[PDB]
């Protein structure tokens, strides 16, 4: 009675579909960091997605589905040399860098790399009043610096950030332009929500991209437009089930299942997860309701999933279930206690 | 895998000629459990697998006479497959799954533990020769002890062989007393279960010991309450075998992780930015899931009145929350170079993902 994903693979192409539809102008590169299932990578390959990888492990994993190196950007802008020149000999020459120590690595390591600054909205992010100084020290580097990116994060309460973002690029765009550089391309990142219940929509957040978009950044045949989106993509595509394997009484109830903060629930702590524990049984009308705490297999006390959400009696051998699990959840997994990773099935 | 030179500090100088690796000190391991034998003299070592799984690690232990606390069927097949019988196996996990049962039995793993009733229920079922110890409460495990008398009832009728009472008081002790209340709490429900006709003669003691030198509890000092706590309340007596769980005492101080420096930013007050090959999602997730708090050391010679800056430290990864040193003063470093964190045996190792790609760093071993 071991714990599974189904990951419903046309839950992805919905999610495209209504990309297209709401931010045309804008060709999606695919964070792989999200989610690496060769399943999501290749749907998404099919429907013709480009895609962003942070490291040398996760070129090569698009780069062996099939995928071509102009549909890959680099975008980690702290980069060990040794993923540089790996990345240079799979013909992948689009990379972000955030500062000019980067731009010394770059000229030693892949000095015909297309460059791309990266704005700040701590981690990373060039202030916009030191961009001017390096851009600079690029020119004297001879860096074929080539646009500007950004990215807002997953805690927008107001999509305001997204269109600060964009105006604050189009001053650093001109920047480069001025200092005679090859800027026509703008990458605005990702953050973009993945689940229906999300306060900020999607719609409206593309709604004030697009209107920041007409203003700064107006068609032309010389500018691409493109994203880094992850969880919007895969979020709402997995679905968790995991089996309760023991169960203790005080009302109150403690229900203990196969999967949790070391497992796929690592979500809870490294991308602020909250999750709502769903019974699989067909619930009857009218059944109580007990304050209940969902633990992980592992010793540790920290291993815990839900404080107390409200759920009907279960027993031992029932199911719960775990919508929209896709994002950061089966990446950031580990093998502690000797617990196993769920396996995934697909619609 | 293995390497030259004496101690720990010496071994890392010589390979350095870029990932990151560890260099485990197997030695300090045997100096921990000398340190044991003489401290808590009537207590068996029952490594915590969990803590640090490394084959080389659980070769030494088992050489020097532990045993072993697995919490999974995949931690029971890894001992096992190293040569070590089933009675030096403790299943101390309170809350099984039924198949992970299923599993302990057919290996010959008999001693397992539990906290309520639910889980006799399964026990009966499942695996109805087994050696059961009842965990006690010092909010996730541990049967509180006024339930204590209602469980070992329902333990009688379902015909359980119950054979002890084992704690856990956890790493986070400032006060070495809840040990002496542990121990005297185990004495109470010991007493039940031979009142009640089990054969009582395990007393489990659980984990939680330091195993660093900046511990500010002390090893020697929490020792001294335990063997007061154990001459009052189990004093010694042939039938009676008392047993612990000590998973980062033994390992904690055995590991050193050596990083590389992969980018630096500066901020002209002067403050430095270092990008290291290895972040949270690798060894330093022990500060996410372990509260571990660690200190960067230069492997590079102290030039003398050098100046220092303050500095943070960021893994390699991709992500805000990617880092492992907020503020620390240290000298300018250079891309290339080497960062040292002590202390990296204890959680490190076992909680690590390759989240973005990144592989974990290499064990290489010193043997002292
Ligand atoms: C990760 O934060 C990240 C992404 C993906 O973010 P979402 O999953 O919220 O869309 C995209 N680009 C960069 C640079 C990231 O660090
Ligand atoms: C894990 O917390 C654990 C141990 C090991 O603890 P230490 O590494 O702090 O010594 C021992 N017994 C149990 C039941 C644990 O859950």
């Given at each position: 009675?071991?714990?599974?994903?189904?990951?419903?693979?046309?839950?992805?192409?919905?999610?495209?579909?209504?990309?297209?539809?709401?931010?045309?102008?804008?060709?999606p590169f695919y964070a792989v960091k999200c989610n690496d299932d060769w399943?999501?990578?290749?749907?998404?390959?099919?429907?013709?997605?480009?895609?962003?990888?942070?490291?040398?492990?996760?070129?090569?994993?698009?780069?062996?589905?099939?995928?071509?190196p102009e549909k890959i950007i680099y975008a980690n802008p702290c980069k060990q040399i040794?993923?540089?020149?790996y990345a240079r000999d799979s013909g992948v020459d689009v990379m972000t860098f955030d500062c000019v120590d980067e731009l010394e690595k770059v000229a030693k390591t892949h000095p015909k790399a297309k460059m791309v600054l990266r704005i700040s909205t701590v981690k990373f992010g060039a202030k916009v009043e030191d961009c001017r100084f390096i851009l600079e020290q690029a020119k004297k580097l001879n860096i074929d610096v080539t646009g500007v990116s950004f990215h807002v994060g997953s805690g927008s309460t107001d999509a305001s950030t997204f269109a600060?973002?964009?105006?604050?690029?189009?001053?650093?765009?001109?920047?480069?332009?001025?200092?005679?550089?090859?800027?026509h391309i703008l990458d605005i990142g990702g953050?973009?929500?993945?689940?229906?219940?999300?306060?900020?929509?999607?719609?409206?957040?593309?709604?004030?991209?697009?209107?920041?978009?007409?203003?700064?950044?107006?068609?032309?045949?010389?500018?691409t437009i493109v994203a880094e989106p992850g969880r919007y993509?895969?979020?709402?595509?997995?679905?968790?089930?995991?089996?309760?394997?023991?169960?203790?009484?005080?009302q109150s109830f403690m229900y203990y299942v196969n999967d949790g903060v070391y497992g796929s629930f690592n979500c809870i702590l490294?991308?602020?997860?909250?999750?709502?524990?769903?019974?699989?049984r067909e619930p009857i009308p009218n059944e109580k309701l007990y304050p209940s705490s969902v633990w992980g297999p592992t010793c540790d006390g920290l291993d815990q999933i839900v404080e107390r959400y409200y759920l009907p009696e279960m027993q031992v051998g029932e199911w719960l279930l775990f919508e929209d699990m896709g994002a950061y959840t089966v990446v950031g997994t580990s093998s502690?206690?000797?617990?196993?990773?769920?396996?995934?099935?697909?619609?």
């Open positions: 009675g071991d714990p599974f994903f189904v990951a419903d693979l046309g839950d992805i192409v919905r999610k495209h579909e209504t990309w297209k539809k709401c931010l045309p102008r804008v060709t399943r999501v990578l290749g749907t998404l390959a099919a429907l013709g997605t480009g895609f962003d990888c942070a490291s040398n492990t996760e070129i090569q994993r698009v780069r062996g589905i099939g995928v071509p040794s993923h540089i020149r600060q973002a964009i105006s604050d690029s189009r001053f650093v765009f001109d920047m480069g332009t001025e200092l005679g550089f090859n800027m953050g973009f929500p993945g689940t229906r219940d999300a306060p900020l929509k999607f719609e409206e957040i593309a709604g004030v991209i697009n209107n920041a978009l007409e203003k700064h950044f107006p068609p032309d045949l010389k500018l993509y895969v979020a709402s595509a997995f679905t968790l089930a995991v089996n309760v394997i023991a169960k203790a009484v005080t490294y991308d602020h997860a909250v999750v709502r524990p769903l019974p699989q502690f206690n000797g617990f196993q990773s769920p396996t995934i099935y697909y619609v």
